Ligand binder design. Structure first.
Ligand SMILES: [K+]
Ligand SMILES: [K+]
Ligand SMILES: [K+]
Ligand SMILES: [Mg+2]
Ligand SMILES: [Mg+2]
Ligand SMILES: [Mg+2]
Ligand SMILES: [Mg+2]
Ligand SMILES: [Mg+2]
Ligand SMILES: [Mg+2]
Ligand SMILES: [Mg+2]
Ligand SMILES: [Mg+2]
Ligand code: NA
Lengths: 183, 58, 141, 71, 130
RNA sequence: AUUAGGGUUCGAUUCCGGAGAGGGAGCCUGAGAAAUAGCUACCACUUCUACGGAGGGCAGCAGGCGCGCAAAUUGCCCAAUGUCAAAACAAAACGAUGAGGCAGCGAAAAGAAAUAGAGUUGUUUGUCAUUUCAAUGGGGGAUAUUUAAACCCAUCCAAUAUCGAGUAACAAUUGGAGGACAAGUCUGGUGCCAGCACCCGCGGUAAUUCCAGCUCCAAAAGCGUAUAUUAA
């Protein structure tokens, strides 16, 4: 009551619940990127739909339109920093051609797996959720963290993690404590 | 003729459920399904896949 | 054919207002006769008292007896017939029992081969009928 | 407005005819608004004449305008 | 690899400002404690800040609102340094002074005060406030 | 809310404007009231009484009782945000405030996210049986931190000196497998019965449809159902 904190939704379910082709493609994506459920794919779908709707509205307007200029520059910038679009292509019609894998590549789990800090995409999610990966000296625990191209270089193991400058984990800590108990 | 209610449910011989090991629950189950359907079975396209194929009977 | 004048907005408004009453759904929604005749009075569920237990013969080509209860709603005191939605669940219902009944799923229309039944029992004695059927709960007293 | 009735004493009824745009049908419809206006004896308007009226304080339970010029 | 090292605390101040109205200096205190087990005590932060700013008395520094950054290693909070302990005691809120140890004794229950006032509302003089 | 567009539906409810304080009416005071934690009187209801008399007004907050399909604590505090005031703060020396904030309850709704990960060996892969190996929570604590105080969060498990997974039992559910509609000519029961089935239909004995087991499917910390409403 008398609270003005805003909240909205980020995903939307498909119109047809059971399509063989859609289910097969979504299972492809889930297995390829190690996703807990289809709701992550649907969230990416909603982000893509919003971006493409904005791009269509801007492309309807004439080129000299100040609104088109400002918002197209903003969307170009956002795509380029977040890595969805290659820097070579700078037209407003390349946002319309974006696909779900383009954003799914930018997730911190996929980025860690590709960079080699993890042996698999299911290993990368565990590594992130277990406070082992730090992006630019900041521990990131969210697998869906979309990585900027400038922050791609700074991804490494956390200084507080055992796979780094931190103290030994539970397996070793508990074994050492048991050895002390025996001695 | 309300005296026959529950007839078949009461006549059904009770069979207890078998105890099986716990299945993966989170994204591990999605991984299991993906490896089973798209990785382990590499059947060529054009042939119908059966997600539940059964031994012949009757 | 219709009017296409530049200043014919009044004619088009009157035409649409007149012709919207021929839509059965629109008229039913915008007229109080349906809500007056609805025993639930526009509610999703309603609570009643089980007057008696009866068996309704299914219509052809089907052939069976469907377990229903004649109940009296506590807010309008109107008699309705409500189907018991599983097998052996009629044994969970006694006379003068405090029951909760919902619609059958067709918005005031008879469902299935049961001739004139549009309601079903969802709760009995403040315990879910499906829970009792699945043995996840026990009927008090 | 245009003079509609001159049967009262020192008072006239004027009609303001306009077209109202109904958005849904993208078309207009003709509407009117009658107004009670006080006409000074300096003017002698006839029914159908065109007048300019200016808003003043309530002079009666319906009169809020005064005739300023007859066209 | 992990090399054992004594825990070190580094104090830093940002958005510094001095107002002569309240006779104090306000700033945001950010502390770096790379290898530190737990959260840095406010008393220790106060002593380090007093030493850093060369204030005559460590009890004329008042610190509050310390939030620990996610992932560890830093906390950030607000701090004030008063011209004297008299100014600190005069201008500091009662709860902060209670944290520092100078606070007033807790008042009786507001419920009891309300009941006493409502009972007195029916009485004449010298029968109320007895 | 939903909608390509045009539309369709919803708005008791946080901000604004109106109205009211059981119902009517009348009023006094005051800059401002036709005021109701003002007054007066009627009419409903009510409470006390020593029977003469005297009272009441939760559509404030908490909380009852009804009524229903349907909705939380007789909590803590003015620390903040404001209001009033004769009033900065402090000093014998802390103004009120159910406004408001804080917590309790709270799968209305929204966001992020667990329920394992890397291998060995045997049994292209894959599977299965082994065999490892670390990691990390849930949780348990604290020099503490937060907070009006608590509480959450965050931080940590030595800094000299800090607990903890293996059936990681710390064991996922809700609906389904004739079609629409993803997924069984499987196996037992039953035999137009019991049932099921939005609709089409299934059950009259070799049930793809019921009651079960096993298996598979879909969504998933959610998933059914009813009734509305938008799209279709
Ligand atoms: K609350
Ligand atoms: K009475
Ligand atoms: K109340
Ligand atoms: Mg109402
Ligand atoms: Mg009023
Ligand atoms: Mg009332
Ligand atoms: Mg009044
Ligand atoms: Mg009151
Ligand atoms: Mg009254
Ligand atoms: Mg669990
Ligand atoms: Mg349905
Ligand atoms: Na209001």
């Amino acid at each position: 009551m008398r609270n003005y904190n805003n909240f909205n939704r980020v995903w939307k379910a498909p119109r047809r619940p059971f399509e063989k082709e859609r289910l097969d493609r979504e299972m492809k994506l889930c297995g390829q990127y190690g996703l807990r459920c289809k709701r992550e794919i649907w969230r990416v779908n909603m982000t893509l739909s919003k971006m493409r709707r904005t791009a269509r509205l801007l492309l309807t307007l004439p080129e000299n339109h100040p609104r088109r200029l400002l918002e197209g520059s903003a969307i170009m910038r956002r795509c380029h920093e977040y890595g969805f679009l290659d820097e070579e292509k700078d037209k407003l019609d390349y946002v319309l051609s974006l696909t779900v894998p383009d954003i799914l590549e930018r997730r911190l789990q996929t980025i860690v797996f590709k960079a080699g800090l993890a042996k698999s995409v299911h290993h990368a999610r565990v590594l992130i959720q277990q406070r082992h990966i730090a992006v630019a000296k900041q521990i990131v625990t969210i697998p869906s963290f979309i990585v900027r191209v400038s922050s791609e270089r700074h991804i490494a193991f956390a200084d507080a993690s055992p796979f780094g400058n931190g103290r030994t984990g539970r397996v070793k800590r508990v074994r050492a404590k048991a050895a002390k108990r025996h001695a | 003729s309300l005296a026959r209610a529950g007839k078949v449910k009461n006549q059904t011989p009770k069979v207890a459920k078998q105890e099986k090991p716990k299945q993966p629950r989170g994204r591990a189950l999605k991984r299991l399904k993906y490896t089973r359907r798209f990785l382990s079975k590499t059947v060529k396209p054009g042939e119908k896949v059966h997600m539940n194929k059964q031994p012949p009977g009757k | 054919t219709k009017t296409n004048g530049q200043n014919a907005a009044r004619k088009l408004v009157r035409l649409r207002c007149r012709n919207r009453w021929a839509d059965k759904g629109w008229k039913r929604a915008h007229t109080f006769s349906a809500r007056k005749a609805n025993p639930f009075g526009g509610s999703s569920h309603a609570k009643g008292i089980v007057l008696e237990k009866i068996g309704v013969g299914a219509k052809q080509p089907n052939s069976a007896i469907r377990k229903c209860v004649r109940v009296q709603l506590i807010k309008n005191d109107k008699k309705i017939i409500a189907f018991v939605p599983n097998d052996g669940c009629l044994h969970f219902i006694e006379e003068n029992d405090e029951v909760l009944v919902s619609g059958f799923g067709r918005s005031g229309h008879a469902v299935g081969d049961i001739p004139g039944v549009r309601f079903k029992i969802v709760k009995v004695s403040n315990v879910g009928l499906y829970a009792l059927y699945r043995q996840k709960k026990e009927k008090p007293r | 407005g245009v003079v509609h009735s001159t049967k009262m004493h020192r008072t006239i009824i004027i009609r303001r005819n306009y077209l109202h745009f109904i958005k849904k049908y993208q078309r207009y419809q003709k509407r009117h608004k009658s107004l009670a206006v006080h006409c000074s004896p300096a003017f002698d308007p006839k029914q159908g004449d065109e007048v300019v009226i200016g808003q003043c304080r309530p002079l009666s339970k319906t009169i809020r305008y005064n005739v300023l010029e007859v066209v | 690899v992990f090399q054992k090292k004594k825990a070190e605390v580094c104090i830093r101040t940002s958005q510094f400002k001095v107002n002569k109205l309240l006779n104090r200096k306000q700033f945001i205190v950010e502390v770096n404690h790379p290898h530190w087990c737990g959260t840095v005590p406010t008393q220790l932060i106060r002593k380090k800040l007093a030493t850093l700013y060369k204030v005559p008395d460590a009890s004329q520094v008042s610190l509050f609102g310390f939030k620990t950054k996610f992932g560890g290693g830093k906390t950030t909070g607000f701090g004030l340094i008063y011209d004297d302990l008299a100014s600190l005691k005069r201008f500091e809120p009662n709860y902060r002074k209670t944290r520092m140890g100078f606070g007033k004794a807790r008042l009786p229950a507001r419920k009891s005060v309300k009941e006493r006032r409502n009972r007195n509302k029916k009485l004449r003089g010298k029968a109320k406030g007895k």
